């Protein structure tokens, strides 16, 4: 047809995503997300809605050969420069903020679901793929990365769009730190994890119903960030920790962060 | 064929420790074809130049073509990655291999704007190669409008 | 700024709605249809967005200085030369047809939502502003317009699509006459009106759960539409009685009508 | 205002009755100004010429004109409501007047197309004056390509 499948990305949440050619006009790989029913700069762009059989569709999508993580695993020691991270940061916040608005909540802002092109344009994506980390050190164990996840889904309260703002302070983090900020391989101990750093919110912050009273957990704490994302700035400081904020009601917009100081 | 989408898959998302895996504790042969008959070297993920590499280690072909004539080359010419560009041709990758419309590597930098990739390559690379529109790096460069490019092929 | 109010046409289903200034470019008279929310000839064109508060938008509309009863109520004592009819009949249904696809249901089909240019061009528009009718004869009463809801609503059982061309029927007769078809002055009152005419379908035709049931009305004739839609042709008759069926499932497309041999 | 919003309300909607109720059992002053400080002729429902008619009876200054310099004349005639261009006209109405950026009635008219109306204003208008982009009725006809206007304005 007008685009030729070169293999399987991978399978996940949604089917199974391929990578083609967009012979179409000529070149250029593509992402092929197979749907069965019954503009942005920093988004990737749907292409093409193939009808499969008359309902079978066929998305087309943007497509990038580089995410967050191969480039951040591939920087030189000393690492990604201020102004670039300040950079990515700042798209990574603009697409979400369109995203957000238009009623969309990605859910899924892992640094795999995070796009950069050659040039360091950032594109969001959401091919639902997982990814399964062995674990370090003896009692090896799987997990699959929830590093990204915020409290109020951890806890299972809440779902709601600062859900997103969360998995970007985690980001922002990595991107200071090149390793993930928060790495535990159980929900309760990945809620371990978030506490020893952010600290053990006050009684009125932590949410009712909740399987994991604040109880649960010790109040140990709440370490200056800066030993963790190191060498970040101030007004960097400001912002992550306005992500990271367990209380998601107090909890930045990424509107209101992109209005932030950190991008004056 | 199987291990051909077991170690293409990985390569394609850019799971080194897959494709290192799968190439080692595993024993893949690298040029093993997936269910599209395409190796991993040449749908990897262009960017992630340690797949490349790892790849092009334990052996991979590097030149290799697509349906369309494309490779591994104007992939990643195309796409930017340099970083890789290099890998590639430092493992006897030829830069000068037309795709199917004419247009060889440094034609797709150029209309791209990969000003270092068109930089590494103009030296190596044919710049007389007529692209499928008759045109040559050069008079591309010129029909873009790149400056900066139309500078380094000057040489 | 880039527009000039000069008037709340009026206020009603969709907030306040206004008559204001293209000087954006120059001239032309555009209507505002204010909004919180936390192609096609026959159909008004939305203009643009304004953001009023970063939210608050501002709808800017296509918007036209005649609207379909002005004109009928304003052409000369022979009346709406056939052609023109079949004609604004076609584009209405053209345009129907266009909101249907695009799964959009109109609901209000009344003749003030139906604009009709100097030219002659039909746009359709949905200000859900009301019209209140005061009686004629001793013992007077008013009522808004529902002289044009289909039975499914007036028996609040359906308000599928189909409900439109109820509507159209409705306008189509009121073209020929110049003077709206059935108009009464309560749900079952209007019900009445439209059974003298249409006449009491079957049994099987009136739906279950609804308050008004079948045995709540008379059988009383079928009369000839055309002794009431005067002047009608047999081609139109066909048209019009398909549009005026009312079992729903058994009621003319606006597709279908639009392919219907009175556009021949 | 109060009234000037009920009546250019009505009038806006083309609501006659209401129109002649406000005005008649009501006595609201024609001229009486909305809360934007237009009069209904001016933002009334320009095709409802029974509306124009009964507002210029009961008295309503038709020559009143925009931020823009605009005025009834400018928007029936834009419009093409010529019915309504000569009941504004029958009543005093100035044809001539120019607009903020000096296109007249009949420059309007020629813009939007409106053959009969341009040769209704034509007679009475001056082709000389010159639009905001200098040209006058006929060489905006001509800009535009209007044969049958250019025709009617030749005389």
């Known amino acids: ?264 | 064929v199987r291990a051909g989408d077991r170690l293409s898959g990985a390569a394609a998302r850019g799971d080194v420790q897959e494709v290192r895996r799968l190439l080692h504790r595993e024993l893949v042969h690298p040029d093993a074809l997936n269910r599209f008959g395409k190796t991993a070297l040449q749908v990897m993920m262009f960017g992630s130049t340690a797949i490349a590499l790892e790849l092009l280690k334990q052996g991979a072909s590097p030149n290799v073509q697509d349906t369309s004539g494309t490779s591994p080359v104007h992939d990643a010419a195309r796409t930017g990655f340099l970083d890789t560009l290099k890998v590639l041709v430092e493992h006897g990758a030829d830069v000068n291999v037309p795709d199917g419309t004419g247009a060889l590597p440094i034609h797709l930098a150029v209309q791209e704007g990969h000003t270092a990739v068109v930089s590494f390559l103009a030296a190596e690379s044919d710049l007389h190669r007529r692209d499928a529109r008759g045109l040559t790096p050069l008079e591309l460069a010129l029909q873009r409008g790149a400056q900066d490019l139309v500078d380094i092929l000057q040489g």
Chains 1, 3 share one sequence.
């Open chain 1, 1 to 264: 047809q007008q685009y030729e499948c070169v293999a399987e990305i991978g399978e996940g949440a949604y089917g199974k995503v391929f990578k083609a050619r967009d012979l179409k006009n000529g070149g250029r790989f593509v992402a092929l997300k197979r749907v069965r029913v019954q503009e942005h700069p920093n988004v990737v762009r749907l292409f093409d809605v193939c009808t499969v059989s008359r309902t079978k569709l066929t998305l087309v999508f943007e497509h990038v050969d580089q995410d967050l993580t191969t480039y951040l695993d591939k920087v030189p020691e000393p690492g990604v420069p201020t102004e670039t991270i300040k950079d990515m940061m700042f798209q990574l916040l603009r697409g979400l903020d369109f995203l957000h608005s238009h009623r969309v909540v990605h859910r899924d802002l892992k640094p795999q679901n995070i796009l950069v092109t050659s040039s360091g344009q950032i594109k969001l994506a959401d091919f639902g793929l997982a990814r399964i980390y062995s674990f370090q050190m003896a009692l090896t164990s799987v997990v699959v990365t929830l590093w990204y996840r915020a409290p109020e889904v951890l806890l299972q309260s809440s779902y709601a769009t600062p859900v997103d703002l969360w998995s970007v302070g985690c980001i922002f983090a990595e991107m200071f730190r090149r390793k993930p900020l928060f790495r535990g391989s159980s929900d309760v101990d990945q809620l371990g994890k978030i506490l020893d750093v952010i600290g053990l919110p006050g009684e009125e912050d932590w949410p009712r119903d909740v399987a994991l009273p604040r109880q649960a957990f010790h109040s140990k704490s709440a370490q200056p960030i800066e030993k963790f994302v190191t060498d970040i700035d101030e007004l960097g400081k400001d912002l992550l920790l306005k992500c990271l904020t367990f209380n998601p009601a107090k909890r930045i917009s990424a509107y209101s962060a992109l209005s932030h100081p950190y991008f004056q």
